[PDB]
Every structure is written in structure tokens, then in C-alpha cells.
Design a protein around this ligand. Structure first.
Ligand SMILES: Cc1cn([C@H]2C[C@H](OP(=O)(O)O)[C@@H](COP(=O)(O)O)O2)c(=O)[nH]c1=O
Ligand SMILES: [Ca+2]
Length: 135
């Protein structure tokens, strides 16, 4: 996979944000993870939702460098959102959330699963430490 620079425009929630990519603003959704809902009335404001939003926000707003890394399959979902692994100063936001118990590994659609094993390994650690979502 190849990392590419992006510029933070606006953090939305734990797993969705707006970035300036290749000159154009675009919304991104983190690959292989799911942070709790804070919008959509059908899901409601789920537990740890606000926590996940704050974690992501802090991490991306304080970063000197943000990079996007598309996987090997489709790069956007049905809603026109870019699907990527996002790095804040070299640290993957996707993994950071999972390791903290702020997100679950989900939506594993191949072949967009290059980092699946890595994220699962972190999820198991968060689980055995009964962190947040796993408490
Ligand atoms: C992470 C991811 C989400 N999605 C879809 C699945 C869900 O569709 P539905 O809206 O049909 O449930 C939605 C989950 O994202 P949200 O967690 O932002 O809702 O976006 C993909 O299609 N591919 C992906 O890789
Ligand atoms: Ca979500």
C-alpha cells in the first residue's frame, strides 16, 4: 500500500472525517473498524460514541502530518466516502481506536483487509484488558 498526504478539514465522529485530498475536500471513513454512533437516530447516541469522537478528534487535530492509505480494493463506499487507513504522525488512527476499546473490528470486505490481522490482534488485547467497549 502507499501512504499519501492529506490535510484535516473537519473531524466528524470516531470513524468519519473530512479531508482535503489531491486538492479536493472529501469525507473519509476508516477501514475495518466501527466506532459507536452519535448521529443517525436509528442507532442513537451509543455508549462510547462521544468518547471515540473525542479520541479521534484530538489525535487528528494535534497531528503535524496526516496520511491516507487506500487498500487494494474499492476506494470509496456507496455514500461516496473514501475508505482508508489514516495515519496521524505515523500512527494509524484505526488501530489506536481498536487498541483503546473505542472501536470494534468490522465491515471486513475483501480484498480491503490487508491490515485485518494487525487490528484483530489489538482488539483481543483491548478485550483481555476489558477496555471501554469491552468493559
Ligand atoms: C467501513 C465501511 C463501511 N461501509 C458501509 C457499511 C455500512 O452501510 P449501511 O449504511 O448500509 O449500514 C456503513 C457503515 O458506516 P457507518 O459506521 O459510518 O454507518 O457504511 C462500507 O460499505 N464499507 C466499509 O469498508
Ligand atoms: Ca460508526
Amino acid at each position: 500500500l502507499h501512504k499519501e498526504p492529506a490535510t484535516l478539514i473537519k473531524a466528524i465522529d470516531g470513524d468519519t472525517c473530512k479531508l482535503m485530498y489531491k486538492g479536493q475536500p472529501m469525507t473519509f471513513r476508516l477501514l475495518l473498524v466501527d466506532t459507536p454512533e452519535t448521529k443517525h437516530p436509528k442507532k442513537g447516541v451509543e455508549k462510547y460514541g462521544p468518547e471515540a469522537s473525542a479520541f479521534t478528534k484530538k489525535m487528528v487535530e494535534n497531528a503535524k502530518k496526516i496520511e491516507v492509505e487506500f487498500d487494494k480494493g474499492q476506494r470509496t463506499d456507496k455514500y461516496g466516502r473514501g475508505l482508508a487507513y489514516i495515519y496521524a504522525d505515523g500512527k494509524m488512527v484505526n488501530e489506536a481506536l481498536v487498541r483503546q476499546g473505542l472501536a470494534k473490528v468490522a465491515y471486513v470486505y475483501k480484498p480491503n483487509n490487508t491490515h485485518e490481522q494487525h487490528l484483530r490482534k489489538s482488539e483481543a488485547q483491548a478485550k483481555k484488558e476489558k477496555l471501554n467497549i469491552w468493559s
